[PDB]
């Protein structure tokens with residue numbers, strides 16, 4: 001079986017990748033491909049198998065188990081809980097699990113509500129009643145919340161939309177590398193700027209942790225932890241809010257239902273995650289030994305991508321999978337992963353999305369998509385499902 005080239009597709013595959021994935025699931029669970037970027041990885045498709053592989057400790061997240069080389073810039077950033085296995089994963093996550101529980105997150109609700117209120121105020125002041133939702137709300141909300149939590153100064157934040165329109169979605173390989181180096185350079189200087197200043201933000205608390213005992217949180221892990229916590233939502237929450245609003249605006253009858261009964265709101269957010277969540281493939285996994293998936297043997301050290309998008313379109317698990325239905329049973333979706341690496345930010349992502357979605361519906365009369373779906377442009381990236389821009393309008 002050849003290597004299916006996804007850069008060849010090309011296309012087209014950016015707009016709607018799903019039939020490709022379903023086409024593979026038909027044959028079997030595991031498939032060699034080459035990305036638009038051009039790397040040889042395995043894809044794992046189909047719900048049951050995707051779910052199992054996410055939580056299977058035969059598939060490592062530690063790059064020591066991978067045969068793929070890292071650049072120096074990549075390596076500088078990889079001492080984080082997501083690119084670790086137990087016991088390191090266990091020790092790292094314990095350092096911040098208390099910060100991110102539902103109940104600690106619930107305390108942020110007034111402030112999140114306040115940030116959204118202000119962003120929409122600003123949005124609604126447009127004379128023509130037209131906006132790009134990505135710029136006015138989807139981007140600035142998550143960055144503002146996570147920057148306050150971690151103590152990134154307001155003037156420093158604009159650089160991050162630049163670095164992420166690079167780490168996450170490049171446009172040139174060397175420039176993703178440059179972005180990485182600059183980001184790491186900056187986070188290191190930010191870390192140093194907290195020392196001895198008695199800050200109460202999370203980054204200042206992590207600095208003292210590391211300084212009190214380097215075996216509990218090394219200086220590399222400290223930088224890794226700042227990095228992962230900061231990037232995670234720039235790539236994800238931004239896209240859930242934009243993909244989800246697009247979902248709703250492009251299924252007017254679901255929008256109408258949600259307007260008629262806002263108690264449906266949490267369920268609608270879940271179905272935005274199921275139908276078009278931002279993570280289309282989970283982060284890299286590395287078999288620690290050959291792994292046989294229904295007669296396909298994945299060799300030790302190869303790159304394995306769990307395709308969450310396909311799992312979410314598996315009809316035996318999610319009937320009429322292509323229907324966006326805000327009242328669907330979404331229980332068991334994979335949009336936040338599964339197993340020891342299950343999303344730590346999930347309560348915070350859900351709080352930000354639920355508040356943003358509610359504010360839009362409540363405050364934008366006759367909110368509409370302001371281009372046809374066919375004119376929207378999705379990033380070519382097959383790991384992150386995200387839009388370049390989301391034009392909307394409302395009645396002024």
Ligand code: HEM
Pocket residue numbers: 054081082083093228229230232233236237240277278279282283284334335336337338340341342343344345346348349
């Ligand atoms: C809608 C928004 C979000 C989505 C869809 C999402 C999705 C995910 C997924 C799928 C994973 C598992 C990756 C894998 O197994 O390969 C994950 C892990 C992780 N997420 Fe989230 N995420 C979101 C928001 C956030 C936010 C806001 C934060 C930071 C507060 C965050 C921090 C992390 C961290 C640190 C991990 C690694 C956890 C571990 O390895 O134990 N995420 N996320």
Ligand SMILES: C[C@@H]1C[C@H](N(C)C)[C@@H](O)[C@H](OC2CCCCCCCCCCC2)O1
Pocket residue numbers: 082083167168228231232235236279282283383384
């Ligand atoms: C550590 C990984 C390595 C990948 N690589 C090509 C440099 C990158 O795309 C990924 O993604 C970001 C956010 C985008 C993927 C979201 C998956 C779940 C969020 C957890 C944080 C990962 C960081 O960070």
